[PDB]
Write a protein that binds this ligand. Structure first.
Ligand SMILES: [Cl-]
Ligand SMILES: [Cl-]
Ligand SMILES: [Cl-]
Ligand SMILES: [Cl-]
Ligand SMILES: [Cl-]
Ligand SMILES: [Cl-]
Length: 261
C-alpha cells in the first residue's frame, strides 16, 4: 500500500493554488530512496490519461481525508524562467527548441481535450535532460437558428484550443524580447492593453519570428494559428519551425540548449 507515511519531505517546491508541492524521498517499497514530487489537495484522472515525453508523469495517486496526494516525477531542471532571467533573452534557435517541444505537448493535450490556458514561463518545467515538461492541471478547462448569434459564441471562445496558441505567442514574445507583449502599470491597465492588442514588433526579430507572433498573437481566435482543425500542426508547419525534425524532437534526441550543470 501507499500512504503519506511512505514519503519523506526534503523541501517545499512550491506553494500553489490551494495546493502545496513537496520534494519527497520514498522510504518504503522497492523504489525506496527514489526522489519524487508530492502535490496535495485539502479536499488526477487527467494526469493518468496522458503519458507524454513533454508532460509530467504520474506515479502514484491516493486519497486520505481530507487530503489528496499526487506523486509525480521530480524534475531537476526546474523552471525555464530561471534560464530566462539568467540571461535576458533567448536566441531565436534556443527559443524555437523550447517552443517546439511545448507545441507537441499542447498538441497532445488538445487531442486529449485539455487546454492549458496559462503558459507563463513559471509554468514550464525541465527534466534532468533539460527538456520541457508541462506540469499544472488545476486551472485547465476540459473541453435554434445561428444567424444572429455572436461569433464568440459560435466558436466556443474562451474555452477552446485557440487560447493556448495565444499563450504560446506571448511566451515566444517574452523569450525573444525578455518582456511580455502587453504589460501595464497595473492589472486593470495591463488587461486593457491585452484587449486593445496593438502589437509592436521589435526590429531585431526575423521575418519568421515576426510572422509567427502576428499569427499567434492575434485577438480573433478563429484566425489565430493553431486555431484550426490542424491545431499544433498549423503552428509546426510555420517557417519558424522549418529546421525542427519532429521525430527527432519527440524522441528527445535533440540536444537541449541548456543542460542543467
Ligand atoms: Cl522523463
Ligand atoms: Cl540563432
Ligand atoms: Cl485518446
Ligand atoms: Cl476547439
Ligand atoms: Cl511586418
Ligand atoms: Cl478583431
Amino acid at each position: 500500500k501507499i500512504r503519506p507515511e511512505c514519503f519523506e519531505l526534503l523541501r517545499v517546491l512550491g506553494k500553489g493554488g490551494y495546493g502545496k508541492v513537496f520534494q519527497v524521498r520514498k522510504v518504503t517499497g522497492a523504489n525506496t530512496g527514489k526522489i519524487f514530487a508530492m502535490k496535495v489537495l485539502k479536499k488526477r484522472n487527467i494526469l493518468e490519461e496522458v503519458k507524454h515525453p513533454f508532460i509530467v508523469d504520474l506515479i502514484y495517486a491516493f486519497q486520505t481525508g481530507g487530503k489528496l496526494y499526487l506523486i509525480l516525477e521530480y524534475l531537476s531542471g526546474g523552471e525555464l524562467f530561471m534560464q530566462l532571467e539568467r540571461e535576458g533573452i533567448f536566441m531565436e534557435d534556443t527559443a524555437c527548441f523550447y517552443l517546439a517541444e511545448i507545441s507537441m505537448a499542447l498538441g497532445h493535450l488538445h487531442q486529449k481535450g485539455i487546454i492549458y490556458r496559462d503558459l507563463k514561463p513559471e509554468n514550464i518545467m525541465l527534466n534532468h535532460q533539460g527538456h520541457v515538461k508541462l506540469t499544472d492541471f488545476g486551472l485547465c478547462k476540459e473541453s435554434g437558428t445561428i444567424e444572429y448569434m455572436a461569433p464568440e459564441i459560435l466558436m466556443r471562445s474562451g474555452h477552446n484550443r485557440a487560447v493556448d496558441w495565444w499563450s504560446l505567442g506571448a511566451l515566444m514574445y517574452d523569450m525573444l524580447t525578455g518582456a511580455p507583449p502587453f504589460t501595464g502599470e497595473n492589472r486593470k491597465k495591463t488587461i486593457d492593453k491585452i484587449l486593445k492588442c496593438k502589437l509592436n514588433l521589435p526590429p531585431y526579430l526575423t521575418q519568421e519570428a515576426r510572422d509567427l507572433l502576428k499569427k499567434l498573437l492575434k485577438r480573433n481566435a478563429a484566425s489565430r494559428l493553431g486555431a484550426g482543425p490542424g491545431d499544433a500542426g498549423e503552428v509546426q508547419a510555420h517557417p519558424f519551425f522549418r529546421h525542427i525534425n519532429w521525430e527527432e524532437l519527440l524522441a528527445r534526441k535533440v540536444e537541449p540548449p541548456f543542460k542543467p550543470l
